Amino acid sequence: MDLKKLLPCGKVIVFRKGEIVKHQDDPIEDVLILLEGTLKTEHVSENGKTLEIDEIKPVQIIASGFIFSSEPRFPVNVVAGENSKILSIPKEVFLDLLMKDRELLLFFLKDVSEHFRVVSEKLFFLTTK
Amino acid sequence: MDLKKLLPCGKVIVFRKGEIVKHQDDPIEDVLILLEGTLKTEHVSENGKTLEIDEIKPVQIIASGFIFSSEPRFPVNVVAGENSKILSIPKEVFLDLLMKDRELLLFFLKDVSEHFRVVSEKLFFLTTK
Numbered sequence: 128m129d130l131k132k133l134l135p136c137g138k139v140i141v142f143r144k145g146e147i148v149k150h151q152d153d154p155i156e157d158v159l160i161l162l163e164g165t166l167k168t169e170h171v172s173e174n175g176k177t178l179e180i181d182e183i184k185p186v187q188i189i190a191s192g193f194i195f196s197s198e199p200r201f202p203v204n205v206v207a208g209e210n211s212k213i214l215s216i217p218k219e220v221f222l223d224l225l226m227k228d229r230e231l232l233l234f235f236l237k238d239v240s241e242h243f244r245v246v247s248e249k250l251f252f253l254t255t256k
Numbered sequence: 257m258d259l260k261k262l263l264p265c266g267k268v269i270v271f272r273k274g275e276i277v278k279h280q281d282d283p284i285e286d287v288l289i290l291l292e293g294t295l296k297t298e299h300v301s302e303n304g305k306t307l308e309i310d311e312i313k314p315v316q317i318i319a320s321g322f323i324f325s326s327e328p329r330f331p332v333n334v335v336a337g338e339n340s341k342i343l344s345i346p347k348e349v350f351l352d353l354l355m356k357d358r359e360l361l362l363f364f365l366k367d368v369s370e371h372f373r374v375v376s377e378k379l380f381f382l383t384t385k
Contacts, residue, residue, distance in 0.1 A: 170384065172384060193369060193372070194365075195365035195369045196370050196373050197366065202373075202376060222362070226354075226361065227355075232351065233351070236324035236368075237324055239321070239372070240324045240328070240368070241325050243321040243322070244321075244322060244325050246375050246376055246379055247331060248331075249379060250378060250379045250382075251299065251331075253379075253382060253383070254382070255299065255307070
């Protein structure tokens with residue numbers, strides 16, 4: 128699956144190094160795909176204290192497992208680690224694309240399931256001594 | 257969404273109280289939906305020692321977030337808590353249904369995302385002191 132084929136479906140947004148793409152708790156309205164550059168994900172704690180969680184390299188959907196929840200929200204700050212560009216597709220349009228392209232649907236469901244499996248296994252290892 | 261509308265799409269399988277529906281590590285081949293009864297999910301530890309995790313009441317997809325991973329596998333034993341009946345739909349057919357019915361697609365993506373959000377938030381609370 129080459130996600131750059133979806134370029135016609137959305138707008139392009141660019142960020143300078145150190146700019147915030149989304150804040151923790153911001154609503155997820157569009158599906159965001161990192162086209163080029165590097166992002167950092169960082170969790171904000173009760174005291175303002177930030178902890179970096181991961182990096183995102185291209186080409187990937189951001190916070191894929193959170194897009195379609197009830198009251199969908201970014202769980203972390205998303206910050207540009209370097210000059211970056213993102214594709215932003217409206218949720219309703221992204222659904223239409225899923226319905227028309229099996230390879231995309233499969234890719235997306237695979238992305239969400241792999242992220243789920245990873246968090247689930249980690250959670251079991253930390254709670255079953 | 258009324259999942260019983262998918263009855264024509266699959267076979268029905270019944271289990272007596274105490275029977276095992278799937279073992280931990282069994283491949284996920286069909287999408288399983290609990291129609292009636294009650295299931296128990298139990299994690300099996302290195303020593304044979306079992307711990308119950310949850311109950312499943314009807315009508316729900318079983319292990320929804322695991323269906324579409326690479327090398328998909330049931331993460332827990334699934335056991336009948338009482339006489340139960342399940343609908344079993346072939347994965348390829350379930351994909352076809354998703355592509356043709358928006359309300360189903362949305363329901364499914366919502367189910368997987370809500371389960372993800374819950375495990376993610378639990379994992380953060382246990383690792384960010």
